[PDB]
Design an enzyme around this catalytic site. Structure first.
Site, short mmCIF file in Angstrom:
data_model
loop_
_atom_site.label_atom_id
_atom_site.label_comp_id
_atom_site.label_asym_id
_atom_site.label_seq_id
_atom_site.Cartn_x
_atom_site.Cartn_y
_atom_site.Cartn_z
N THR B 1 0.83 -1.20 0.00
CA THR B 1 0.00 0.00 0.00
C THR B 1 0.86 1.25 0.00
OG1 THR B 1 -1.96 -0.96 1.05
CG2 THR B 1 -1.58 1.40 1.34
N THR B 2 0.80 2.01 -1.09
CA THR B 2 1.54 3.26 -1.20
C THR B 2 0.57 4.35 -1.62
OG1 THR B 2 3.20 4.45 -2.47
CG2 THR B 2 2.23 2.50 -3.47
#
Lengths: 245, 229
Positions: B1-2
């Site tokens: 998750t970015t």
């Protein structure tokens, strides 16, 4: 057996006198509103007269927006209406929060009618002396289009749809004019400009003053722009000049 | 998750990956971490998905009512403060890192970062998520403030593509959105068009000489790529 009319009780002939006197509070402030719906849009016109000339002409209103999609006009005792809107707005958020869709218009009318019936049952509360009119456009099913809707809720809670409603001072003459105009044409086939002309003609028939642009505020909902929004005076003047002929 | 947000003159640019993972399995490979609150205020949410979805929808339900009541647009400070308050009185039960970015006519474009702890820092550019730590030393080098709108979205897509190339928990589509005076505009570039990927990077084409042929000299000459050889 002595009072019969100071609280919420039935009187011998079968009436709730507090709900029968709350119909005399709406017709007290001398205001009058007319809401009509054409094929594609809903319009609501109200008297917005500030006889005093030191008051901000853009502070006191009648049109409120309950939801981005649903608006309402409040005829009658001025503060009551305001309070009622807040209640409606609350019921929207709850609904909007609990079911994930924006609240339908019939559901809002039914719930705001029920809330009005509760006050006419307990002895303590005073019934809201205001005839609310919620206008909007709803999703029509099996085709997806938007259909215009006008709903009225009384102090008793007698919610109901309409084709054209009139409320307030001299509302009977306005309704009579609208009925006579309807016997010829078909209201659900008119366009927005004609409908607004009929609404302004009804309002000028009920009071008989040939209103100018700054005494009426008009709010509209359109299939093109589904949001409730009020239309400027530069547009109402165009309907006044056209009714003038 | 970015997830990340970068501020420019007009407004802000939000970028994020699209992949929710169950530790080592890609549960959803086309997720959408950019949740709208208002028309002009968005939030990128990271950490758990249930908690951040409940928070985003509760705060957006609050924002819809405040804006209807006052009748005029909402600042970003309002939404950021609401998020901070909520993610602060649930700080023991949720793991939720938020990036609230938007545009208001008063203060232009604004970006607030609300980390796991529950603080709220108003920044010029914010990064978040498990794959963020690969982006700090990318922004210290290749980022200069005062960029244009187009160069900003190019830099944001490039940063996300450099973050999810090395990170295992991130990947998939790159979803960006630009919020400024005009209409908010969206964009989703797939993986087969990303501005970077470690398979098409020509410095990772020649392989490590690991499988030495059984030979007679100590000269290294590459792997053993067949039985005959």
């Amino acid at each position: 057996a002595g009072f019969d009319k100071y609280i919420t009780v039935f009187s011998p002939e079968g009436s709730l006198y507090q709900v029968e006197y709350a119909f005399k509070a709406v017709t007290y402030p001398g205001l009058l509103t007319v809401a009509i719906r054409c094929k594609d849009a809903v319009l609501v016109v109200t008297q917005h007269l500030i006889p005093d000339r030191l008051m901000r002409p853009d502070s006191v209103t009648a049109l409120y927006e309950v939801t981005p999609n649903i608006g309402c006009c409040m005829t009658g005792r001025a503060p009551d209406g305001r309070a009622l809107v807040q209640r409606a707005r609350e019921e929207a958020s709850d609904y909007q929060y609990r079911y994930g869709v924006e609240i339908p218009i019939a559901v809002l009318a039914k719930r705001m009618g029920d809330k009005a019936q509760v006050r006419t049952q307990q002895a303590g509360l005073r019934p809201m002396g205001v005839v609310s009119t919620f206008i909007g456009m709803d999703q029509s099913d099996q085709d997806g289009s938007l259909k215009p809707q006008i709903y009225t809720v009384d102090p008793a809670g007698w919610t109901g749809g309409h084709i054209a409603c009139a409320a307030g001072k001299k509302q009977v003459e306005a309704m009579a004019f609208l009925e006579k105009r309807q016997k010829s044409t078909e209201l659900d086939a008119l366009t927005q400009k004609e409908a607004a002309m009929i609404a302004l003609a009804a309002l000028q028939s009920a009071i008989g003053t040939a209103v100018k642009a700054k005494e009426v505020e008009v709010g509209r909902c359109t299939a093109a722009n589904p949001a409730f929004q009020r239309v400027p005076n530069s547009e109402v003047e165009e309907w006044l000049t056209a009714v003038a002929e | 998750t970015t997830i990340l947000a970068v501020s420019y003159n007009g407004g802000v640019v939000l970028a994020a990956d699209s992949r929710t993972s169950s530790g080592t399995y890609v549960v959803n490979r086309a997720s959408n971490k950019l949740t709208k609150l208002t028309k002009k205020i968005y939030c990128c949410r990271s950490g758990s998905a249930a908690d951040t979805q409940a928070l985003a929808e509760r705060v957006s339900n609050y924002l819809g009512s405040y804006q209807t009541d006052i009748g005029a647009g909402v600042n970003v400070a309002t939404a950021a403060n609401l998020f901070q308050k909520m993610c602060y009185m649930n700080r023991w039960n949720i793991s939720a890192g938020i990036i609230v970015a938007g545009y208001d006519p008063i203060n232009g474009g604004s970006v607030y970062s609300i980390p796991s702890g529950g603080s709220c820092v108003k920044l010029d550019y914010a990064l978040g998520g498990s794959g963020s730590i690969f982006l700090y030393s990318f922004f210290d080098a290749n980022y200069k403030p005062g960029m244009s709108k187009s160069e900003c979205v190019a830099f944001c897509q490039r940063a996300v593509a450099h973050a999810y190339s090395r990170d295992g928990s991130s990947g998939g589509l790159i979803r960006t959105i630009t919020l400024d005076a005009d209409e908010p505009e969206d964009q989703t570039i797939p993986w087969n068009r990303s501005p970077y990927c470690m398979e098409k990077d020509p410095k990772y084409v020649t392989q490590a000489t690991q499988n030495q042929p059984f030979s007679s000299s100590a000269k290294i000459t590459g792997n053993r790529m067949s039985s005959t050889g």
